[PDB]
Symmetry: D3
Subunit: 143 residues, 6 copies
């Protein structure tokens, strides 16, 4: 059962859209990461979220287990951004994204352990400036 | 070019995530924005499409008669369900259910008036098993022209 | 190398859209089947094409090999009709379709054997009359 | 309701499959139809999207300036590539190539003028390995509102 | 680094395809593996998932309480179904059915004791028309951290 | 009806996972099966496909000339890749790579001599980040009539 006050998905988004909310979240038991990425190569958008998440202390740089949790969460977020085909550049479109990574327990029971949320917000469009609209994605996984 | 003050997607989400109590709906409307808000919980994805659709028709978000409007919204709803289902646009057949809250926002988000009106379909809620506690959050935003 | 005069895909479509072209095609070495299907259940659209194909002599009712060839071809056609999600009814949409099945060799070499083409044309829309547009699909497989 | 005389999809295909030599383009145009025709062969799917797009811009099928037009056509091209790729919208990364012919038709296909204008993207050609003979036919039709 | 002697994927599959007075489930358990075997035949995916989840909770492979382990086993099954369905995670609605045998394995397949527990869902059986003899083999394996 | 002794899927997989002075390829060939084994590691799907196709044509599993058998082996590989990629048939473009071992088997797995020849492509290895130790097992099997 989700704890009304710690819905990690909702929080990672509210954090992503508003222009230190991080301090507040960190004051509560949240591990938080933030970054920007503009690319037409999905692997760059993925490598950046991983690099940022490991740089800050959101997930362990050592081992595979947390990288697995984060990778799959990003994949679930990239789904909301690409809507059907997980392709950017190859389908003549590129993204300018802002992302947010949260790690912690969103449930009432302490036995649920930590979970990780990957959130993406920005524009998706043609390889030109004024040719795009908003794109959103949120990935949630157990870690 | 886009607007810092009129990003239909961002806005539509803000309204979706906020519980109370103030009227963020009044603000958007007063500002040339057609807005809809409803909540749907189903094991059938078609019920979620119908729900949003109908509400978008009662509240003059889109036109009740015709198809051109109902079409731009169908794909918006669809593109919103991708973020929600992430891969397989299936719920009950995949032993999963959704408890959702939705927001349909219609209006032009561009600096240039020539871009015409657009519509966004944002979704939020939970996705998990048929049983109550087992689940986590699920998000989805769809932006179509109209 | 395809034989300019016997492009099975092109022929199954030209046959599907025009209001006996079948006789002519049959006069050449083509096995042809025709039918109509209106449904919100994909399995019905699939079972009809199979039933029609076996009734007429397009494929063998006996055995699995030809049913396999036809099933996969229909699946490839259903892709063009559903565009992304192979769902009709469950995604609040239904179809009224006309289909065409062709069997024969479309290549210059006789060693290419027979191939089978599944073609679909009609409307895809809401569970209401004047709320739809055209949908098309063509599946091609070796048999 | 639809028209027996103005089904943008059916028509767009007829023009695509016919080789000569008469001018079926003259007929459609004379009858309030924006029409485009080109051929593209690529191992890169983006080149097929660009090709159709650009031609639709040179020939005033859609508007060169703005986005609202370029958007309705992108999804049409996309929905057309589903019929072509059938599952994975990939070509070269899946060791396959396409030799295509495309037709972009813009105009209203409904009995009621209120439905506004629509655009269809039909594709036809071959899909097979990089080598010449190895391949079979491939078809795809995309219909978006605009 | 995957400990060459404890490759959870490979083992679960070998168990799955083994015709054997010789219990392999015994060895696997003597060694720290929690093992579960089953069989479910159906034209409904949600029944296969359900069948695997219930067998897993009854035997001790995963916890009956809490979401965490259920979430882990769910996505793992999902990934195994991908191999079985190859494209469209649908059975009856695409006029096809499956007769599966299934293994679920839990343990640490790595050298480092920090990797913790992982889980593998493995499927093997047939897939084909509702009619008895028209079908061919199908296989699927999903691995996930738990 | 799948002849219990010649289940092409199961065999190809067992061969794939077998550590063995004991050649199984021998028995399979003594019995009418055309067998091919290989290994390809890469972050490019088109290389895996290519690798399988070349090995298959060099050894005699499929004809080097004509499209028919190539078309058969192509879709079969495609279906096997689905299990390996589970959702997105992409490797490097999704920051991941695979180290596969592969078997290709050709023969009639049915009782009736009319079913003719069928073909199975089976894959097993790892999938994970470009960096050495971060990965887990992956499996895939595609069956098709040839
Ligand atoms: N609007 C498109 C992206 C795009 C590319 N070019 C123009 N638009 C989408 O939904 O992804
Ligand atoms: N975790 C699943 C939903 C679910 C099904 N059962 C339990 N949870 C998802 O991401 O959609
Ligand atoms: N036009 C939709 C179908 C639909 C259902 N309801 C309205 N439209 C499509 O592309 O499939
Ligand atoms: N047959 C493949 C294309 C192909 C690749 N290589 C040979 N043919 C398809 O249906 O797309
Ligand atoms: N051969 C089909 C199953 C099937 C349906 N009808 C006949 N066979 C598959 O690969 O899923
Ligand atoms: N675990 C991923 C592969 C991966 C990419 N990065 C790390 N691991 C998969 O299931 O494909
Ligand atoms: Mn993984
Ligand atoms: Mn549509
Ligand atoms: Mn099959
Ligand atoms: Mn778009
Ligand atoms: Mn989940
Ligand atoms: Mn093919």
């Amino acid at each position: 059962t989700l704890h009304k006050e710690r819905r990690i998905g909702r929080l990672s988004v509210l954090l992503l859209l508003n222009e230190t909310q991080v301090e507040e979240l960190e004051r509560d038991g949240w591990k938080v990461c933030l970054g920007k990425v503009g690319s037409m190569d999905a692997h760059k958008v993925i490598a950046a979220i991983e690099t940022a998440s490991k740089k800050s202390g959101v997930i362990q740089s050592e081992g595979y287990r947390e990288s697995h949790a984060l990778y799959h969460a990003t994949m679930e977020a990239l789904h909301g951004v690409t809507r059907g085909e997980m392709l950017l550049g190859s389908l003549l479109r590129t993204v300018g994204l802002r992302f947010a990574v949260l790690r912690g327990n969103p449930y009432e029971s302490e036995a649920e352990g930590d979970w990780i949320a990957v959130s993406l917000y920005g524009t998706i469009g043609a390889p030109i400036k004024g040719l795009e609209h908003e794109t959103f994605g949120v990935g949630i996984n157990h870690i």
